[PDB]
């Protein structure tokens, strides 16, 4: 399984994801970005089955980019979460559902920063911190231990690295490299890759 994590602070929505994509026993790509940018200030971290991720997240990326073109202003992160939740929910009763586990993360000029969670059944939940994959089972309790709601963005990188070192020590899959990027009020920056 592939790994997602998000840490919301007072003004930043720090997210990370692995850079590995795997077939059966080999792994095929060593630098695979699983993060899709939708606006200047929101992302969408999508994992799940083969194929359904790049078909759903590209569908949500261009329909939210279509909202910016028709209107000039971009969607809020809350409305982009409910737009993502709306499409994933009403297709799971159709003949072609999607098996994508999402982690949406954006900043808003009025409402502030926001991290969103949904499973493959499209149950949207706003969380201060969330994670996906089998590696979520290890790393949520480092986050349940050391997360204050007012954590600085430099103490959130070191909180992120404690979670990723737990995957190096305890998790059975080789997840050596991670893409890390921050979503403060100035947009989507890109922190240096945490690798081991």
Site string for another protein, 43-72 (x = CB under 8 A): ----------------------------x-
Q: Is 70 left (phi over 0), alpha (psi -120 to 50) or beta?
A: alpha
Site for another protein in 77-136 (CB under 8 A): 78-79, 82-83, 85-86, 89-90, 92-93, 110, 117, 119, 121-127, 130
Site string for another protein, 133-172 (x = CB under 8 A): ----x-----------------------------------
For 42, list phi and psi in degrees, rounded to 5.
-135, 155
Q: What is the C-alpha separation between 18 and 26, in angstroms, rounded?
A: 16
Based on CB atoms, which residue is closest to another protein, 93 or 145?
A: 93
Other CB atoms within a 10 A radius of the CB of residue 195 amount to: 11
Q: Is 62 left (phi over 0), alpha (psi -120 to 50) or beta?
A: alpha
Based on CB atoms, which residue is closest to another protein, 24 or 94?
A: 94
Whether the CB-CB separation of 55 and 96 falls below 8 Å is answered with: no
Residue ranges that bind another protein, judged by CB under 8 A: 71, 73, 75-76, 78-79, 82-83, 85-86, 89-90, 92-93, 110, 117, 119, 121-127, 130, 137
């Amino acid at each position: 399984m592939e790994y997602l994590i998000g840490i919301q602070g007072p003004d930043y929505v720090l997210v990370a994801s692995d850079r590995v994509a795997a077939s059966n026993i080999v792994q095929m790509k060593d630098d695979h970005d699983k993060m899709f940018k939708m606006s200047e200030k929101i992302l969408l971290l999508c994992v799940g089955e083969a194929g359904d991720t790049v078909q759903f997240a590209e569908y949500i990326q261009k329909n939210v980019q279509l909202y910016k073109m028709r209107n000039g202003y971009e969607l809020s992160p809350t409305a982009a979460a409910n737009f993502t939740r709306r499409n994933l929910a009403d297709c799971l009763r159709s003949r072609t559902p999607y098996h994508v586990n999402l982690l949406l993360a954006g900043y808003d000029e009025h409402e502030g920063p926001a991290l969103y969670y949904m499973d493959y059944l499209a149950a949207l939940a706003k969380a201060p911190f969330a994670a996906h994959g089998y590696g979520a089972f290890l790393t949520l309790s480092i986050l349940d231990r050391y997360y204050t709601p007012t954590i600085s963005r430099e103490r959130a990188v070191e909180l992120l690295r404690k979670c990723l070192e737990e995957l190096q020590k305890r998790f059975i899959l080789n997840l050596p490299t991670f893409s890390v990027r921050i979503i403060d009020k100035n947009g989507i920056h890109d922190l240096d890759n945490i690798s081991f």
